[PDB]
Every structure is written in C-alpha cells, then in structure tokens.
Amino acid sequence: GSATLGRLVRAWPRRAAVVNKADILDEWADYDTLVPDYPLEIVPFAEHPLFLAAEPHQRQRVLTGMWIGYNERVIATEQLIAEPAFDLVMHGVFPGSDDPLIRKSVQQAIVDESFHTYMHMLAIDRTRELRKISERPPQPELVTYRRLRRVLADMPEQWERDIAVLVWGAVAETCINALLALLARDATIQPMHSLITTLHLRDETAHGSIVVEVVRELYARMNEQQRRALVRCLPIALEAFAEQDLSALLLELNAAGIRGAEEIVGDLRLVRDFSGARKMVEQLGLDDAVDFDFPERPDW
C-alpha cells in the first residue's frame, strides 16, 4: 500500500491536535479583553471610508462577528461536508475502501474532525460569553452546501450521490481556506484564536495528503460510470469552493450598525489554496480533463 498513507498513519499520534493540545479549554485562563478577536489586515473593507466612518466599538463588533462567523462556517463544513465523505469511505460503499490502511488513515481523520468541531465550538462559546454577545441572527446556509444539495436533489441513484458526497468532501479537505492559514500566523489577535487555527491547519495539511491517496486508490477500483461521474463532479465542486458569497459580511456589518453596509458590500489574497486539489487531479491523471482554472498558489 501507499507509503504516504503508512507514514501518515504512523505520524498521527505525534501530529494530531487532539493528542497534543486536548487541554485547549484552559487557554482562556488569563483573558485580555483589550486584544482583538480578528485581524483588521485581513478584512476586505478595512479601509473603506464607510467602515472607517464608524465608531471604534462598531468596528470591534464587526471583527468579533467575523471571528464567530468564521468558526460557525468551519463547524458546518466539517459536519455537513467533510465528515460525511469520510463516513462514506468507512462504510465501505466504494470498491477498495475495505483496505486496512485506508480505514486507519480515514478513521484518524474522523477523530481529528470531531476535535476540530470541539475547538471551534469552544471558541464561539468563550467569545460570546466574554464579549457579552447575548443574541446573534441565525446565519445563512453555506454556499458550498447549497451547491451540494442542489446537485444531489434530482440524482436518481445512490451510487452517484455517494460519488458527489465524496468529491465535495475531497475538495473541502484539499482546498485550504485562506482564513485558516492567515488566522494561524496572526500575532495581533487573541492567542487562543491563532492557536486553534494553527492546530487545525497542522491537521488539515495531513488530511489533504490522505485524501489525495485515498481518492486515487478508490478511483482506480471504480467502474467506468463511477469514474465518469467523479470526473464530471470535480469541476462543479471546485467552482462551489471558488465562489465567494458575501452575504455573511452584510449581516455582520448590519449587525454592528455600520451605515452604508449595502454600499460597502456592494462595493466589494483571500483565495483558497487549491494546491492540494490540483495534486489530487494530477494523481488521478485528470490534468487535462477538468474544466477549472486553478488560481495561483498563495504565498502563505
């Protein structure tokens, strides 16, 4: 079997966030209210005159809101997109998925996603308590999940729905959110915010390598119509993860009471790193068969 997979399975105890920082709760120990929740430098409208025209506490409420929103979207992605793909592999629904090495690598990833959900859930609860955020509008559906559900809606056959779910999860796990990596390195924000994202990023880098190996092995064992289906679905999943939907920004800005929120939003790097998914496409020998313009590899 895959030496990459063997190596990833062996490294998991030395690498995983759940093993090496299970005590994340205690990181709020000596909290400092004076330190921001989110870095202004990665806010796209940070220097828009209408955002600058606001009062300092209003800008701070937007930053806090964007931090909470980012954590909400991470949890929804894990729960609705990434974990269901991992679960399908473990269920043995694809030929070749009964392999001990595939099963070990993916079950480890499932433990990691559980702990990721734990960390991000903690981040929301602690922030809401400490910032005294009593109430907050029930946020919109993920654009990525909306696309998934619409693809699946009129699909007759379970075998094809399984392919779509796998591909959506695979793309999610190989296309790293710019906010994950930018938040991870940021020294200006709450140290627990930088830390949680640092931990998640370390695990996600391994998850992308696992997904590349696992998808190669399963595609190789798939029949032609399964293979064909995987191929059609890739560009659709890739475009869903490339698509920016700034509905969340509008709600945050309106929440904070910033005047001209519609103007600021309507007025509008932060691209995902698609390196992993490009490697995935390469490993499948699909380097000319996928209709997607891959963005440049980010500096970070």
Add this chain to the structure above:
Amino acid sequence: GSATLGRLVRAWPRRAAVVNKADILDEWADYDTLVPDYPLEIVPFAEHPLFLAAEPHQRQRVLTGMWIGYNERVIATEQLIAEPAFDLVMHGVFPGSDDPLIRKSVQQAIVDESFHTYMHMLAIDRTRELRKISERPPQPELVTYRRLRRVLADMPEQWERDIAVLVWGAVAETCINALLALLARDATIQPMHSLITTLHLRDETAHGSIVVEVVRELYARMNEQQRRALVRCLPIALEAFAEQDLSALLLELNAAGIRGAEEIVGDLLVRDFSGARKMVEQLGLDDAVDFDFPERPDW
C-alpha cells in the same frame, strides 16, 4: 451548571484514551503469539463436553473469533446506537441542548467514541493479520439494534424517532457490558486486548456520568407528549440491553469447525445496570419504570 459535568469536562484531557494512548497501534510491537486473545474463564461453553472434545487449535480459534466478535459488536453499538444519540443532542433538536456545558461534555464524548471505534477496528485488523484469518462470515444484526428498528417502525414520526434514538443511546452508555469489564482486568490475555478495554472502560465510566446529567436536563424541557414517549421508551431499551442472544456464539463454533454447535447453544454475563438505575432516579421515574434491575456485579 452541573458540578459533575463541570468536573468531567475539565478532567477530560487527563482521562481520555485518545490523549493517553493515541499510539495504541504500536502496542503490537514485540508480539507473542503464545498468549491467548480471549479468556476461556469467561466463555459460557468453555466447560461443555462438546467444546472440550474438540482439538487444541479448534478451541483457540473460537477464543480468537469471540475476541473479534466482541470488537465487531462494540463498533456497531457505537456507530448505530451511541453516536446517533450524542449527535442528536449536538444538533440541538431537544430544548435545552444548546447549553455550552452540555455541548462540551457531549462533544468530548463524541471525540471519545470516534477513538474507541479506531481502537477496536485496529484490534480486529491486527488480530486477523497475526492469527491469519482470511475470511469471516457476515455477522448477525445486533440484538439491541434489531429491537431499535422495531420500536422505530412502531413509532414512525420524526419527533418520536428522536426520543427513541436518545433513550437507546442513553441506555447503551449507562449499562456497562460485562465483557468490557472482565476483559479490562484480565492478566492472561494479549496485553493490548486488556489495554484497549481498560482504556474504553475508563472513558465509558465518565460517559455514564455525563449521560445521567444530560438526560435529566433534557427531561425537564420536554413537553407532555415527549416525556410520555421517553418514559414508555425506557423499559423497552432496558429489556433490549438485558436480552441475551446466542446467535453469535453459534457462529463462532461454526467458524471454528466444532461438531454439535447446536447442542452446545441449546444447552446454554449480565451488564452493570447501576448507571441506568441512577438515570431512572434522576428523572424521578423510580416507580414508573417496569423493569427489574439486576444486582450490581462485583466488578
């Protein structure tokens, strides 16, 4: 907020198997094939004449099968019974489940169950490799799960189905498998077999405490007709976890080639219900539940 829930949440990093023995895979290192997989002492037909009249390799193959069978059932219980109940709580379908202390304790439990599945899956894989078992017959559907399907068939509405799933999960997590506890303490079997079960039991002791606290809190917030279904639901789940089904024994004796397997099973390990009894008290359902709780086992 519950002081028990609070203590268990803050102790989780020190307690959790996932933190303490993530490298469980490496425990197979200096592997000794001479050490049995499973203790004869706890095999219900160990002293049956037809079992004793089989060859040494045949009896050792049964022990291997029962160990693998144990692990298969643990995984199935976690996947089909325990995790769904915990997920239901996290999906906030019940009033009062949005509480951050409840969410922390249950999410930590969910991390634990994913790691338990991992441990048990690898015990199966490492045993099958080292003992050279190339094929194993399809296993029977869990008795507990078969009974679950039945109740859900009888109670088909979405809101009914949530309550049944929760109770099924709750009973599973508060009634400790005799085999879990007896394997954990066994000094004669493969050290990693007693280790995995020791680790799982340590976690499960906490989970039982968690479930009693959570279910109580969720009980307070249900409407008349939800409470109704939960109270009527408890004894059926409890009966399900108490009913002893012999079908998996008859399969190990065949997988091993033992003659008169039917007679053996014809001629034929009660859970510790202590945690579930407490759950019943905590709900004030002491007089309401028609179920006869067995005496606590010494272990």
